[PDB]
Amino acid sequence: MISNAKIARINELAAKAKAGVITEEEKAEQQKLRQEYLKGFR
Numbered sequence: 001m002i003s004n005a006k007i008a009r010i011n012e013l014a015a016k017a018k019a020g021v022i023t024e025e026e027k028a029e030q031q032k033l034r035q036e037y038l039k040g041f042r
Helices: 005-020 024-040
Strands: none
Touching: 005 024
8 A cells, every 4th residue: 555755765776776787785675675565565
Protein backbone atom coordinates (compact mmCIF):
# COMPACT_ATOMS: atom_id res chain seq x y z
CA MET A 1 0.00 0.00 0.00
CA ILE A 2 3.11 2.18 0.31
CA SER A 3 4.00 4.55 -2.53
CA ASN A 4 5.51 7.64 -0.89
CA ALA A 5 9.05 9.01 -1.36
CA LYS A 6 10.13 5.45 -0.55
CA ILE A 7 9.07 3.86 -3.84
CA ALA A 8 10.33 6.91 -5.72
CA ARG A 9 13.68 6.84 -3.92
CA ILE A 10 14.16 3.11 -4.46
CA ASN A 11 13.55 3.36 -8.22
CA GLU A 12 15.76 6.45 -8.38
CA LEU A 13 18.76 4.93 -6.59
CA ALA A 14 18.22 1.54 -8.24
CA ALA A 15 18.05 2.94 -11.77
CA LYS A 16 20.94 5.31 -11.01
CA ALA A 17 23.31 2.72 -9.57
CA LYS A 18 22.02 0.43 -12.32
CA ALA A 19 22.63 2.70 -15.31
CA GLY A 20 25.80 3.81 -13.52
CA VAL A 21 27.86 0.87 -12.23
CA ILE A 22 26.10 -0.61 -9.19
CA THR A 23 28.06 -1.78 -6.15
CA GLU A 24 27.62 -4.58 -3.62
CA GLU A 25 27.21 -1.91 -0.93
CA GLU A 26 24.48 -0.07 -2.84
CA LYS A 27 22.83 -3.26 -4.07
CA ALA A 28 22.77 -4.50 -0.46
CA GLU A 29 20.87 -1.39 0.67
CA GLN A 30 18.15 -1.66 -1.99
CA GLN A 31 17.87 -5.30 -0.89
CA LYS A 32 16.51 -4.59 2.59
CA LEU A 33 14.38 -1.75 1.22
CA ARG A 34 12.63 -3.88 -1.42
CA GLN A 35 12.71 -6.99 0.77
CA GLU A 36 11.05 -5.04 3.58
CA TYR A 37 8.27 -3.62 1.40
CA LEU A 38 7.65 -7.07 -0.07
CA LYS A 39 7.37 -8.47 3.46
CA GLY A 40 4.63 -5.96 4.30
CA PHE A 41 3.21 -5.49 0.78
CA ARG A 42 -0.56 -5.52 1.44
